[PDB]
């Protein structure tokens, strides 16, 4: 089945730039950073080569790697190549635009380096503007430690970059930091300007925040691990698709086992869900492997797996012509199975 799942056309809707870095690139850039004294490489080297402690370690180091434009451009290209190689036909790539007055980096310039990364792709054909071919669109993430003001800078930037494929805004970062009330006004501005919205939601128990995010009616949410019954009821009546990150939830212990993961309940209740990687480099997985885990856990046929993969199209933030092309790609690949 794994060869079949790897050839299946897939849609990735929750993948972070910083977390999708290939390990070889991580090793190389880490070594050059330590060779500059910016860090000691022995502390990172063996992990770079599993546990919760360790994945937090990698997140740490990666923040330090992504401080120069060249690196942002490179990892953007490599991430698009890797996803395309496993037959993702549509990718919404999210990242947090990052400021560093020192390196001359603004959020705008960081994002420009991302666009340069998309233009530099050569191993696959790419559509991002309006041999494998991959459609790429961008989500700008607001980090939970930002202020309302900073969040608004991210939203304004996203609106200016709609011509190069920015389709929406995300809220992410440590779910124990910050207050919804800080980010609601910026996200409302985004939504009122017809950007699409996805929210990391319910990653920790937080009943009031979960209800406020649901009441906002974003266009998608990520995870939903600690929803209560009234949360599920509101989610299902509002019909908000859930980005399901199986390995991520398991490794971080937001969900105790795949056998109780709510993605099964959502699937059987005919609620829209999309299997996503979250950070495939950091979590040592891939979209094909996430599909493998889900197919095994639910006991899906090839037919049900294909219908599930195809159903993600109407949850994308892409323009209608892109979605019609995706419907064509899936119609056209169903013959295989």
Is residue 203 part of the annotated active site? The answer reads yes
DSSP 99: -
Nearer to Zn ion, 146 or 278 (CB): 278
Residue 46 CB neighbour total at 10 angstroms: 8
Nearer to Zn ion, 82 or 278 (CB): 278
The answer to whether 228 and 201 are in contact (CB under 8 A) is no
The answer to whether 297 and 258 are in contact (CB under 8 A) is yes
Nearer to Zn ion, 231 or 278 (CB): 278
Integer Cα distance of 172 and 96 in angstroms: 9
Secondary structure of 246-307 as H, E, C letters: HHHHHHCCCCCCCCCCCHHHHHHCCCCEEECCECCCCCCCCHHHHHHHHHHHHCCCHHHHHH
As to burial, measured by CB atoms within 10 angstroms (0-12 exposed, 13-18 middle, 19+ buried), residue 237 is exposed
Binding site for Zn ion (CB under 5 A): 278
Annotated binding site: 14, 16, 18, 63, 95-98, 143, 173, 200, 203, 278-279
Tell me how far, at minimum, the Cβ of 203 lies from Zn ion, in Å: 8
Q: Which ranges constitute the DSSP H helices of the chain?
A: 2-7, 23-34, 42-48, 52-65, 69-85, 107-119, 148-160, 180-192, 207-216, 229-238, 246-251, 263-268, 287-298, 302-311, 320-333
Nearer to Zn ion, 62 or 329 (CB): 62
Tell me how far, at minimum, the Cβ of 101 lies from Zn ion, in Å: 27
Annotated binding site for N(6)-methyl-AMP: 16, 18, 63, 95-98, 143, 173, 203, 278-279
Tell me how far, at minimum, the Cβ of 259 lies from Zn ion, in Å: 23
Tell me how far, at minimum, the Cβ of 180 lies from Zn ion, in Å: 17
Annotated binding site for Zn(2+): 14, 16, 200, 278
Catalytic residue among 12, 146, 203, 209: 203
Tell me how far, at minimum, the Cβ of 223 lies from Zn ion, in Å: 8
Catalytic residues: 203
């Amino acid at each position: 089945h794994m060869e079949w799942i790897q050839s299946l056309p897939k849609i990735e809707l929750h993948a972070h730039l910083n977390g999708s870095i290939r390990d070889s690139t991580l090793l190389e850039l880490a070594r050059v950073l330590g060779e500059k004294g910016v860090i000691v490489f022995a502390d990172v080297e063996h992990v770079i080569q599993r546990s919760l402690v360790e994945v937090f370690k990698l997140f740490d180091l990666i923040h330090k790697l992504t401080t120069d434009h060249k690196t942002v451009t490179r990892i953007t290209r490599e991430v698009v190549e890797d996803f395309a190689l496993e037959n993702v036909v549509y990718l919404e790539l999210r990242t947090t635009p990052k400021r560093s007055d020192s390196i001359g980096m603004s959020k705008r310039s960081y994002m420009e380096a991302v666009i340069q990364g998309l233009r530099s792709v050569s191993e696959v054909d790419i559509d991002f503007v309006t041999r494998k071919k991959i459609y790429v669109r961008l989500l700008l993430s607001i980090d939970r430690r930002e202020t309302t003001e900073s969040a608004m800078e991210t939203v304004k930037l996203a609106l200016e970059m709609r011509d190069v494929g920015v389709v929406g805004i995300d809220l992410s970062g440590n779910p124990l930091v910050g207050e919804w009330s800080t980010f609601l006004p910026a996200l409302q501005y985004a939504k009122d300007n017809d950007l699409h919205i996805t929210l990391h939601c319910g990653e920790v128990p937080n009943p009031k925040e979960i209800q406020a995010m649901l009441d906002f009616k974003p266009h998608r949410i990520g995870h939903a691990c600690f929803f209560k019954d009234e949360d599920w009821t509101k989610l299902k009546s509002f019909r908000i698709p859930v980005e399901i990150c199986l390995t991520s939830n398991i490794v971080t212990k937001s969900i105790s086992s795949i056998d109780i993961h709510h993605f099964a309940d959502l699937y059987n209740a005919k609620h829209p869900l999309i299997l996503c990687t979250d950070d495939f480099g950091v979590f040592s997985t891939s979209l094909s492997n996430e599909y493998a885990l889900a197919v095994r856990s639910l006991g899906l046929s090839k037919s049900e797996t294909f219908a599930l993969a195809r159903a993600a199209i109407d949850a994308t933030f892409a323009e209608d012509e892109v979605k019609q092309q995706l419907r064509f790609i899936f119609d056209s690949a169903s013959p295989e199975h």
